[PDB]
Amino acid sequence: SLKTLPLYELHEKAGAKFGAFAGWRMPLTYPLGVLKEHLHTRAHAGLFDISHMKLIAVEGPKAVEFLSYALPVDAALLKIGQSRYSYLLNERAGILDDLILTRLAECRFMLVANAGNAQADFAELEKRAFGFECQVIALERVLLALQGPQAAAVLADAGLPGNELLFMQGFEPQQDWFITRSGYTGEDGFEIALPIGCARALAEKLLGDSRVEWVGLAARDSLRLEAGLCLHGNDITPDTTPIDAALTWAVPKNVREKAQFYGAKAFLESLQKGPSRCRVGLKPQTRQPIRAGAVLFDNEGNRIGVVTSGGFGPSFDGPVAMGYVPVAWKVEGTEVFTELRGKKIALSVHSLPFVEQRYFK
Numbered sequence: 001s002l003k004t005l006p007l008y009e010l011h012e013k014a015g016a017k018f019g020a021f022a023g024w025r026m027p028l029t030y031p032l033g034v035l036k037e038h039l040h041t042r043a044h045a046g047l048f049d050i051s052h053m054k055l056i057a058v059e060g061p062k063a064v065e066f067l068s069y070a071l072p073v074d075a076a077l078l079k080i081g082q083s084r085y086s087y088l089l090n091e092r093a094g095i096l097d098d099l100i101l102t103r104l105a106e107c108r109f110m111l112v113a114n115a116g117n118a119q120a121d122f123a124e125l126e127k128r129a130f131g132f133e134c135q136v137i138a139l140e141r142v143l144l145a146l147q148g149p150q151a152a153a154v155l156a157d158a159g160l161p162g163n164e165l166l167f168m169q170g171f172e173p174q175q176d177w178f179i180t181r182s183g184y185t186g187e188d189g190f191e192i193a194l195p196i197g198c199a200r201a202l203a204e205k206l207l208g209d210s211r212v213e214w215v216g217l218a219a220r221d222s223l224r225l226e227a228g229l230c231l232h233g234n235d236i237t238p239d240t241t242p243i244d245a246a247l248t249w250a251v252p253k254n255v256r257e258k259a260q261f262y263g264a265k266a267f268l269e270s271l272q273k274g275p276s277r278c279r280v281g282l283k284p285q286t287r288q289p290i291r292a293g294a295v296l297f298d299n300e301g302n303r304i305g306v307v308t309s310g311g312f313g314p315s316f317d318g319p320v321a322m323g324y325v326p327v328a329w330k331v332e333g334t335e336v337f338t339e340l341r342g343k344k345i346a347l348s349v350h351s352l353p354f355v356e357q358r359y360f361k
């Protein structure tokens with residue numbers, strides 16, 4: 001009943017330890033281990049099987065107009081090859097999913113959807129497309145991320161194109177292949193989407209490079225959390241608007257002013273009213289991590305918020321977390337508290353990212 005990765009056997013051969021995520025059986029860690037896999041990515045090149053994510057193609061003569069209604073983007077202004085972070089909003093401007101949109105041609109675009117939301121995102125995009133002369137197509141693909149300071153060199157030595165991309169650009173080097181210079185680590189890196197029948201060979205070719213190791217979901221999580229990146233279902237949900245989540249930067253002024261996207265009225269009203277709670281970085285004042293779901297209190301014991309993500313960051317060399325506090329507590333350095341074994345434990349509100357980003361310039 002958990003979904004199976006196309007490359008499951010490679011993970012089994014690599015000695016992966018498996019667990020459930022977003023309805024898939026995923027490698028959580030390998031024998032290298034959560035700490036060294038994390039550190040490996042920041043020093044070398046980590047290979048991540050992210051085939052649980054979903055590519056959705058959007059194609060047809062009115063793809064541009066459809067996209068500018070479905071999402072808060074000006075799809076006509078996106079240059080061919082350019083990627084943008086965006087989100088599918090509901091009528092109340094809650095975030096159904098966060099997405100990356102890439103223009104591939106005048107009438108062709110690609111979306112990458114999160115694993116847990118792929119089916120719902122596809123159904124909702126299809127309904128928003130009812131009026132438009134465009135098609136929305138869920139693709140069957142393997143998706144690999146190759147991340148770290150050596151990733152570009154590994155890519156070149158494997159004979160794959162992409163070193164010419166800038167950060168947040170993408171292209172199609174072969175029919176049914178899609179490569180982007182992007183990721184979820186705060187490092188330089190790439191994502192490669194390709195047909196399922198071509199994938200095992202590619203993954204074995206990249207792993208064969210002495211700079212490359214497989215990285216599991218645990219380390220994927222510590223990396224992204226150090227980088228200050230949101231995880232939908234933890235840090236953003238259909239109950240959090242981009243205003244609460246401090247993600248309004250993703251919607252440029254011209255798009256706000258045109259207000260043609262689904263959710264625009266609620267988005268604009270939320271922007272005027274201000275946030276109902278605020279996504280913040282949190283630094284536990286302890287060597288032991290505070291985990292997702294930890295309740296946050298003020299200095300008098302009143303419940304004020306919650307930790308949405310938390311773990312040990314090996315690069316930061318201590319616990320890192322993110323969560324929600326009311327606007328009054330969002331100032332950098334503000335003390336908030338949680339309870340552990342009946343003792344009050346302090347966290348301070350902390351800038352994000354925790355670790356400096358090293359995207360290609």
Ligand code: NA
Nearest residue numbers: 207209210212
């Ligand atoms: Na290797």
